[PDB]
Nucleic acid binder design. Structure first.
Ligand code: SF4
Lengths: 50, 50, 172, 98
DNA sequence: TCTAATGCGAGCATGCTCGCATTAGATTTTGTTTTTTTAGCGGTT
């Protein structure tokens, strides 16, 4: 038929996976910041400040 | 393995290939098998989880 | 070539209608809405809408898509509004614009051939939209291109907007 | 991914940098060339690895000298052309000595 | 591959939102793991 679309468990697993992933990225950030002893620099870039 | 399955030519196998490969090659199915096997190896009983 | 020889080749002088690409493939339809068979067939059909460049005419577009009465086309990347005029999102340009590009190509050919005969074999990879020839090129080990090494740099090519490109063609 | 450019910039400023890398080995020109030598020793009938070794500082043939090699034999593999230039050339020339 | 910008017209409160369609852009990985024991030749063919 040449058709495809997400099944329910796929969407569920997608949402669930996004959650888990986000949570872990947070833990990554925590490890990164807790590494420091005396100084901490955060450099990030953006399109527009305002 | 893939050559043997194609050789056997079972309808089920083609039903799988058609769904998880592109219109000109079957590499994506290769990757799929690899990925699934690998993931299953993180359980104490990989087969049972499969 | 098709236009310049048109009068000689088959009979009479012609006018550039457009340049079209046809994507050869067996597409998969990704629909969130349930589709009847006719609707699926229509979506599959839509996947083969040709990209390229056209000449902005009611006549030209209508000739390329005789089904189009109003709205967007499923064959050519152009449309007709309720008013009837070609709608702005169409990939069409003026006859003059076509002439500008077509003259420009020959400009490039002339210069390139001249530099080729002059003995120019310099290592000058371009870089446009993070895309470089080098990845698709087999001679990376022959050139031994080394950015760190001085006097070995990419040619920055700008992702300029089509309108600008045309302006620059006008100037040149 | 961002690490290489950073290292370059810090060295431009003069700061000493150390990063444990897991990629980019075969993009090193030295590695590409040394490999090319190995391939050529394996089977000389690979035009690109050959040409690579020739233009490399290992041999040092320049673009004119390379095209000169081609001229001896156009249709043949580059290796054959190299063989032929060796056959017809005279000991007096620099390219022959290379 | 999903998010964002652009275009056009229908219904609403002549000018405005909203629906929808569509395309076009750009934007983009992380990782580690070993040692294998254990007693040189051979004069002379
Ligand atoms: S690889 Fe060497 S030759 Fe091929 S494009 Fe990049 S630079 Fe020019």
């Amino acid at each position: 038929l040449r058709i495809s679309y997400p099944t329910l468990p796929l969407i569920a697993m997608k949402k669930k996976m996004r959650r888990e992933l986000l949570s872990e990225e947070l833990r990554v950030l925590y490890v990164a910041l807790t590494r420091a002893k005396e100084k901490l620099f955060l450099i990030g870039s953006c399109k527009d400040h305002q | 393995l893939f050559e043997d399955e194609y050789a056997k030519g079972e309808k089920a196998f083609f039903e799988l290939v058609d769904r998880y490969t592109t219109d000109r090659h079957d590499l994506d199915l290769q990757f799929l098998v690899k990925q699934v096997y690998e993931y299953s190896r993180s359980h104490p009983n990989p087969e049972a989880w499969l | 070539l098709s236009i310049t020889h048109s009068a000689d080749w088959l009979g009479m002088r012609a006018t550039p209608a457009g340049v079209l690409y046809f994507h050869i493939h067996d597409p998969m339809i990704q629909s969130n809405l349930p589709l009847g068979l006719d609707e699926i067939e229509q979506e599959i059909f839509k996947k083969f809408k040709m990209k390229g460049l056209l000449l902005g005419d009611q006549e030209v577009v209508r000739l390329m898509d005789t089904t189009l009465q109003e709205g967007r086309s499923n064959i050519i990347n152009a449309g007709l509004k309720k008013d009837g005029s070609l709608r702005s999102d169409s990939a069409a340009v003026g006859e003059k614009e076509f002439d500008l590009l077509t003259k420009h190509v020959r400009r490039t050919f002339q210069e390139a051939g001249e530099q080729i005969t002059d003995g120019r074999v310099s290592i000058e990879p371009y870089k446009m939209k993070n895309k470089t020839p080098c990845t698709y090129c087999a001679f990376k080990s022959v050139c031994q291109f080394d950015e760190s090494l001085e006097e070995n740099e990419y040619r920055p090519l700008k992702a300029e907007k089509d309108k600008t490109i045309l302006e620059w063609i006008k100037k040149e | 991914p961002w690490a290489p450019q950073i290292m370059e910039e810090l060295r431009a400023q003069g700061i000493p940098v150390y990063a444990n890398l897991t990629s980019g080995y075969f993009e090193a020109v030295e590695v590409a060339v040394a490999l090319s030598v190995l391939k050529v020793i394996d089977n000389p009938y690979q035009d690109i690895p050959l040409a690579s070794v020739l233009r490399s500082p290992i041999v040092g043939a320049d673009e004119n000298e390379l095209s000169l090699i081609r001229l001896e034999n156009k249709k043949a593999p580059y290796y054959e052309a190299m063989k032929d230039y060796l056959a017809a050339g005279d000991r007096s020339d620099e390219l022959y000595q290379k």
